[PDB]
Write a protein that binds this ligand. Sequence first.
Ligand SMILES: Nc1ncnc2c1ncn2[C@@H]1O[C@H](COP(=O)(O)OP(=O)(O)OP(=O)(O)O)[C@@H](O)[C@H]1O
Ligand SMILES: Nc1ncnc2c1ncn2[C@@H]1O[C@H](COP(=O)(O)OP(=O)(O)OP(=O)(O)O)[C@@H](O)[C@H]1O
Ligand SMILES: [K+]
Ligand SMILES: [K+]
Ligand SMILES: [K+]
Ligand SMILES: [Mg+2]
Ligand SMILES: [Mg+2]
Ligand SMILES: [Mg+2]
Ligand SMILES: [Mg+2]
Ligand SMILES: [Mg+2]
Ligand SMILES: [Mg+2]
Ligand SMILES: [Mg+2]
Ligand SMILES: [Mg+2]
Ligand SMILES: [Mg+2]
Ligand SMILES: [Mg+2]
Ligand SMILES: [Mg+2]
Ligand SMILES: [Mg+2]
Ligand SMILES: [Mg+2]
Ligand SMILES: [Mg+2]
Ligand SMILES: [Mg+2]
Ligand SMILES: [Mg+2]
Ligand SMILES: [Zn+2]
Lengths: 465, 47
Amino acid sequence: KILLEGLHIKHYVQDRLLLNINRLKIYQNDRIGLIGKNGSGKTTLLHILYKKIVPEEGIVKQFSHCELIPQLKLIESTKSGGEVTRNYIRQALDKNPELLLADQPTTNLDNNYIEKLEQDLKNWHGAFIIVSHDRAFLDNLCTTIWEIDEGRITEYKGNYSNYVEQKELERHREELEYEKYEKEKKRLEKAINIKEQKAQRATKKPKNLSSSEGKIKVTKPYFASKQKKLRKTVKSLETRLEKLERVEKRNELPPLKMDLVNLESVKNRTIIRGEDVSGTIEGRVLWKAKSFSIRGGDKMAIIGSNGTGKTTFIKKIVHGNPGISLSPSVKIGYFSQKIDTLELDKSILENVQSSSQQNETLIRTILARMHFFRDDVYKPISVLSGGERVKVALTKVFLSEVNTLVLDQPTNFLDMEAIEAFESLLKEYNGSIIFVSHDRKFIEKVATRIMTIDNKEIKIFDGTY
Amino acid sequence: RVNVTLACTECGDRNYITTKNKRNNPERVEMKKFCSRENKQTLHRET
RNA sequence: GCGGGGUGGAGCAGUCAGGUAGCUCGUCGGGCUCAUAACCCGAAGGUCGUAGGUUCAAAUCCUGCCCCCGCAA
RNA sequence: ACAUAGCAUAUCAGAAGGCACACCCGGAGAACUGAAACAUCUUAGUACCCGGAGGAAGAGAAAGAAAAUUCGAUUCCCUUAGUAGCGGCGAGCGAAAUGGGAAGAGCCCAAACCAACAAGCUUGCUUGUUGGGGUUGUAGGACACUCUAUACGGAGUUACAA
RNA sequence: GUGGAUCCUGAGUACGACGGAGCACGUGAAAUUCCGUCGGAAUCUGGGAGGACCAUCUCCUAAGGCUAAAUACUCUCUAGUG
RNA sequence: AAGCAGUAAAUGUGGAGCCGUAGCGAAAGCGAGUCUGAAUAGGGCGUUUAGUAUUUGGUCGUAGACCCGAAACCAGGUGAU
RNA sequence: GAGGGUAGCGGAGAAAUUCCAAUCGAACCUGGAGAUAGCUGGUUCUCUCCGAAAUAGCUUUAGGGCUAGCCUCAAGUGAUGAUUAUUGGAGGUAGAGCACUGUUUGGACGAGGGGCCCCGGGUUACCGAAUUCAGACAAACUCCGAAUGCCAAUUAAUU
RNA sequence: GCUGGAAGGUUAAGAGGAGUGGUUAGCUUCUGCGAAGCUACGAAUCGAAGCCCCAGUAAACGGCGGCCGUAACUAUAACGG
RNA sequence: UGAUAUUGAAAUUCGGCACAGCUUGUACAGGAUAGGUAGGAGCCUUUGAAACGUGAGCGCUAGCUUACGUGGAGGCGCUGGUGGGAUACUACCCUAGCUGUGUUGGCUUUCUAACCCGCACCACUUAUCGUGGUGGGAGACAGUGUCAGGCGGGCAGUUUGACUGGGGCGGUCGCCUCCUAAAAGGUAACGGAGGCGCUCAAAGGUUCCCUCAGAAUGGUUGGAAAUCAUUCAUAGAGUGUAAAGGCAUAAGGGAGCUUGACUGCGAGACCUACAAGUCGAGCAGGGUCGAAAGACGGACUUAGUGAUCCGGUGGUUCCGCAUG
RNA sequence: GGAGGUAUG
Ligand SMILES: Nc1ncnc2c1ncn2[C@@H]1O[C@H](COP(=O)(O)OP(=O)(O)OP(=O)(O)O)[C@@H](O)[C@H]1O
Ligand SMILES: Nc1ncnc2c1ncn2[C@@H]1O[C@H](COP(=O)(O)OP(=O)(O)OP(=O)(O)O)[C@@H](O)[C@H]1O
Ligand SMILES: [K+]
Ligand SMILES: [K+]
Ligand SMILES: [K+]
Ligand SMILES: [Mg+2]
Ligand SMILES: [Mg+2]
Ligand SMILES: [Mg+2]
Ligand SMILES: [Mg+2]
Ligand SMILES: [Mg+2]
Ligand SMILES: [Mg+2]
Ligand SMILES: [Mg+2]
Ligand SMILES: [Mg+2]
Ligand SMILES: [Mg+2]
Ligand SMILES: [Mg+2]
Ligand SMILES: [Mg+2]
Ligand SMILES: [Mg+2]
Ligand SMILES: [Mg+2]
Ligand SMILES: [Mg+2]
Ligand SMILES: [Mg+2]
Ligand SMILES: [Mg+2]
Ligand SMILES: [Zn+2]
């Protein structure tokens, strides 16, 4: 079967072309891993295919019906992240879609429910498109891969490893062909120059030619025709040079580079302390009353399954002093598991500068390192993609005057090439950080005081393994 | 900055062409213009 | 007259596509050593030739000027 | 190994080959040129080569033109008309029907079926040759039925037998 | 001449796909018609055509042969002409 | 016109056909007015009559097209004395 | 030396673009064929009337062409043409001038810097400038502005 | 360039036949729906060599560097970057 | 190089479809291996519960599966709790594998009978041709035909600008504005200087209001140059963007409302070889603003473009090869 | 207990 078609779709999103798509087709028994950097067009495209978002230009026709488990879900913090996402997955696979459209289904999950989900989707016989950035997840799940580069949807039979391999060889092939072109052009231009020198020599008299030979004046046309011959040859070479197949570099974006403006670190004997924090809401012991203490320079981590209470632990840190003992030195930078920014505040600039006191050029430069360009920092914050909302939250919380960072689910929507910058920044941060994350392999670099919540009790050790 | 075809929101007839910044006026732009069939000045969106 | 260039002391990236100036050797102080070299630890040293504009942001784009290299003359 | 090439002997107004620097049918088939260059296109299915036949050739008695009160083989002249169309919609190529005239002519086979003979010798009735019969669209014929009539007639060696 | 019980009325044929040509008609919406390859019908309640294709209505009855005339030319013979 | 008769004649015959008498509009179509157009407005093109047949001359087109004059291209053949 | 073989979209070549019947950047003959020639040359008797052009625009166009412009013939309109007188008008030239734009001389002050001496103060000096007196430059300066030429006229005359 | 390798990718004819569309026997409630049949298009998927790719080959094609500093005269620089 | 005829017979093997059977189903938490739905409070039990043992399948190494022998009465569930979802039990089904019956092809070889042997021998025959015959080899490949892809100066047909102080290089080719340009207009050169291939949903339309730059002086972060206050100042500012011509009775700068950056046209004019380009009152329709008069078919003006053929998209009281 | 081979100054 077919299940869907899309024809001559153009989605400009602003002046910039986001998507130029032809003969989009996703048939029965089809399992597609869609990928691209932040801001590439993934969530937008899937919304178009689910018909929720009609484009500026083009046709879509779905033959079998669909279900779109959403991202940036608009639903209030009555439950935990992860639990919400579990609920939406369950909705989808209850509804019997025959095409499942997933934009980041692995958000705020635990590895265990992830394992159930990959098992469900291997046992699954329908179709799907899926967006994760989880390498092993896709390597298990998918059969086809799509790449959004600049609206151009490149298709790739196999596994995310095959994507890496194919794109590697294509990058390499392209660079080599470019070097070949440059080298050839260089050579022919040099030839042109030499041949022109000779052509200019052709007409000028020699040296030490006396009276009778100099007064000779009949041979001017002979030499002029010889000069025309050599210059005709330069014309031939220039023609060849034009007939060369021009070939470009890719305008490759500069890499991600995050910053922390300064921590004048003091490293004193203790930053946080607390004792017997009764962890509950009502009728539920989320965790036992326990103490804790955090010291100068600690890359504290948290590891817990769903519905444990990591988020609430961090909320107890950030507000209230029940069994807590803080100091006036620590100035928390709170990055939430939710947005924390102002949606329709009329600029990233404003929403950031609210909490920081620094120069416009430094802040727009940091945003430019995050790849928010000159005309993009006035974009609203609601319009944005998830990963770039996350980046802007992080920047606001960096340029906040802080020394301890408190990060509930970072690295969540971000891409594989900003999570590495983030990995390295946190590795190299002279100060304290506290955070949640389900990625032990991210944590391998980072953690120095690993925690673990489980079974309504707590444990805390030091170092990785 | 790009070409633009308008169209009436009660018959569907284009009736006008113009131009706009796709940056500064990004949305599906709409203005009231005469429509030669209804013989009334009618709201015409873009298509 | 035409065409390329001028980024700490030397040689090279970065300019095409504007987003916090980088690499090797060197220089300075301290170490090791019987002393010097190597080696180990730190630190300086760059109005990106200059003067104007555009930009929130200039080595980067535009202008003008002073040199350097070839060709010529 | 039967017999099959092959080989030997007799008979043919049997063929060949020439041409009228013409006419016709078929094979195979250019380029200069023009397009203000050129490659599709044109030149041109032209010229040259080749085969064959005739005094004429070819085509030809609708699996057709058409669209009214329809016409009744073909071919050829006129006119339709440089129209309709074909066309790098460029250069340019370019009809036909209708309608008016010359001339006018229509016939035979295959199949069904009958009969004789031969192979199977079903000894049942399948196959083949011969002779009969029969040939078309407002469907026809075999098959059965009724009238005739055995050259009275009718037609012929330009088709319809020679 | 009547009758309509059954039998017969042209097969690797028509047609189609591909490639080509020829039809005034350059593949074009390309009907009609030949060739090569491959595949492959129907059977008178049939088959074909009326410029893609379908239906209706009308006209014929493919895949088998013969057929003068009117038309073309002139080596040549005769009689003549400008 | 062809064709028929006629002395290779004129001439007779033949009215298929052709131009014209009505245009406008892409066309359906309407009609001295039509097309545009909402319009009876305005405008375009037309009306408010003479064309036709043969022919002299001139010019143009198609045919070698005022004469001569290439280097060259193609096809078929002749040449190793 | 003989007898012979290889044939032109070819053959032979101890290789030179060399030979293939006194010429080979692809033989000779015939035909297509009167190839094509925007190129040169030539184009035959007389008289009469009128009588140019060598310019614009476009042109794979520049020594070719098409259209206009200038010519001739015919039919028609019918004084609409020419010249001058007068009136009016548009326009910024030669000249002249410095009222702006830029250039420039010599002065009077200076606006305050700079080199140098000891916070301030000096200087046989640049003077960036500002102002002012006098004299000067201009195709792309003009407060001004001719003669001519032009466009017309309910005008007159000559043609 | 040639030689070998052959994983993977891209890649035709043909095989395959999802889906769209035309007609219409019947239904219709307003003029819409529309079986089969015949038709015009026709996707996914399969689908060789080649190409991308890996290696080798130079009596194969072919190619063979700059700038700066430096030693008992100064020049040069065995030497260094 | 591949498909397809020539072009056959056998089989292993691998796959896809159907049907039958053996079954098989572990995220974390939870009593532990929780497949889907429904029914579900009883199911099993001397026709043998638990427990002991082997054998054996699966397996995530937890454990379930079941052929059995000893054994002889409990074992399991709703409830409980957990968890997204409840366990017994049963009806039907699904995943995954295996097995089987049948289809369905494919690769793979095997064979011989087509086809092939410039293999041998025999005869025609005296013959190195050929034909036939026999025997060996190869074999449904090759070779041949049609269709398709790739390579392919081996070969052919052709293209491969113009201007221009000779040609050539260099430069230019179209459009806009100044000067040359000789006071109308027009006017050339490889004469001199510069720009264009856009931009603006307001920088348009309209109605209201406002008038600049620069200097002196006073004043914090000091050329007091930022911003302010006054006086002077008629244009030296600004006019999106080149220059010129113009605008301060604003064409410049702000504010409010809007979409005339409308439809159908268009007398008469400019320029003009043509094709095109420009201006355009005014009429009608239907309107924004303004109290009204009235302004408004873009922008202070002049550049900001590209013929036809062709194809694409939309609409239509247009044809539609007999009729529809 | 002894013999033989097996970085600068
Ligand atoms: N309405 C809008 N206007 C302007 N920019 C927009 C608009 N909507 C989206 N964008 C920008 O275009 C891109 C939108 O793509 P999309 O939301 O699909 O991203 P994504 O692939 O889902 O990203 P991520 O991995 O961050 O979730 C982002 O760059 C976003 O900033
Ligand atoms: N208002 C509330 N009412 C009831 N329960 C709540 C409320 N807020 C939170 N909870 C529950 O408290 C627990 C909080 O979970 P929390 O978000 O802290 O966990 P976590 O470690 O971040 O896990 P994850 O994000 O992966 O779900 C969850 O059980 C959540 O359902
Ligand atoms: K055809
Ligand atoms: K017919
Ligand atoms: K000779
Ligand atoms: Mg997303
Ligand atoms: Mg949470
Ligand atoms: Mg030509
Ligand atoms: Mg055929
Ligand atoms: Mg000779
Ligand atoms: Mg000829
Ligand atoms: Mg005279
Ligand atoms: Mg003067
Ligand atoms: Mg002057
Ligand atoms: Mg060649
Ligand atoms: Mg030619
Ligand atoms: Mg020239
Ligand atoms: Mg010259
Ligand atoms: Mg000269
Ligand atoms: Mg003038
Ligand atoms: Mg019809
Ligand atoms: Zn409307």
